[PDB]
Amino acid sequence: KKRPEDFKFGKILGEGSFSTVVLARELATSREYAIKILEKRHIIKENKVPYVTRERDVMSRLDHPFFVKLYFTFQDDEKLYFGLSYAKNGELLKYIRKIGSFDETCTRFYTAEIVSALEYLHGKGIIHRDLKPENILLNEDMHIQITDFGTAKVLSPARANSFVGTAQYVSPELLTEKSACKSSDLWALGCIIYQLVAGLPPFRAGNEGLIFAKIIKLEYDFPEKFFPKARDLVEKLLVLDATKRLGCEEMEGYGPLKAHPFFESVTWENLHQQTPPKLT
Numbered sequence: 001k002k003r004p005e006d007f008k009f010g011k012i013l014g015e016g017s018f019s020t021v022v023l024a025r026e027l028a029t030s031r032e033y034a035i036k037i038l039e040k041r042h043i044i045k046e047n048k049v050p051y052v053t054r055e056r057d058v059m060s061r062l063d064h065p066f067f068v069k070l071y072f073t074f075q076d077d078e079k080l081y082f083g084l085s086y087a088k089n090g091e092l093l094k095y096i097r098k099i100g101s102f103d104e105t106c107t108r109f110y111t112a113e114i115v116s117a118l119e120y121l122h123g124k125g126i127i128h129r130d131l132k133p134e135n136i137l138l139n140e141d142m143h144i145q146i147t148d149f150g151t152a153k154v155l156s157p158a159r160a161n162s163f164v165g166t167a168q169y170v171s172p173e174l175l176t177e178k179s180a181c182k183s184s185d186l187w188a189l190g191c192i193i194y195q196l197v198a199g200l201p202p203f204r205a206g207n208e209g210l211i212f213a214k215i216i217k218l219e220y221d222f223p224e225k226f227f228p229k230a231r232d233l234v235e236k237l238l239v240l241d242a243t244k245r246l247g248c249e250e251m252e253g254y255g256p257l258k259a260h261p262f263f264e265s266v267t268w269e270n271l272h273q274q275t276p277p278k279l280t
């Protein structure tokens with residue numbers, strides 16, 4: 001029902017391989033949206049339509065404060081437009097790079113929000129499959145806003161067969177069995193926790209193949225100082241057997257995960273309304 005004429009477009013927020021995200025003000029309401037714009041000829045020609053349709057379908061299902069919201073979509077002759085919530089503070093990755101690593105309180109708090117987010121997502125039977133700090137945005141208040149649902153999968157009411165993801169965060173089962181499940185996201189969570197504390201994700205190399213070989217061998221080490229209860233949690237997530245990761249369904253879900261000693265001081269109830277600790 002909305003049209004391009006309905007908005008004043010401002011600065012480009014970022015660019016993807018087949019998309020541009022632009023900050024826009026809706027004239028009729030004065031609201032700010034991040035508008036994702038896809039060229040129809042380009043997505044048809046480069047075979048991206050399945051990913052565009054998947055992103056719209058998955059995002060339409062989501063209604064949780066830790067996810068970017070899809071408010072509306074429209075199209076004209078040349079373009080599709082997705083109106084998204086504007087995450088003013090950009091990617092979580094920017095903050096890991098800037099400050100180098102998070103202290104225990106910040107690690108705990110941001111990990112808790114991600115765990116809360118994943119509990120919601122897996123409860124709806126959806127796997128993300130590309131969870132990483134670049135795909136975790138931050139709103140004006142510094143709460144997380146998970147994004148990038150074009151490679152997500154709605155599981156039909158355990159396993160998904162498309163090969164998708166980012167080498168550093170890909171789970172061993174996707175490499176060796178050629179499928180992913182909810183537990184694959186918990187593997188990515190382990191990588192992200194490690195990255196928050198250590199400054200880099202645990203499987204690192206300058207090319208994907210070398211990363212793959214390390215992942216399948218569980219070849220990684222903790223830096224000398226690494227919060228002991230965080231290390232224990234990481235060891236319970238970075239497990240080759242996907243059925244043995246803390247938080248997976250065969251480990252009886254998110255209850256035991258949230259009960260991990262690392263999260264002891266966490267109040268899970270209204271996390272999105274708590275004041276995040278300052279990063280720095």
Ligand SMILES: Nc1ncnc2c1ncn2[C@@H]1O[C@H](COP(=O)(O)OP(=O)(O)OP(=O)(O)O)[C@@H](O)[C@H]1O
Nearest residue numbers: 013014015016017019020021034068084085086087
């Ligand atoms: N809702 C949003 N609010 C603020 N910034 C955003 C939002 N969505 C995306 N961005 C920024 O714009 C960039 C482009 O996002 P987009 O989803 O179009 O492609 P991408 O996922 O970065 O790249 P690719 O699709 O090629 O992997 C993001 O990397 C992010 O920095």
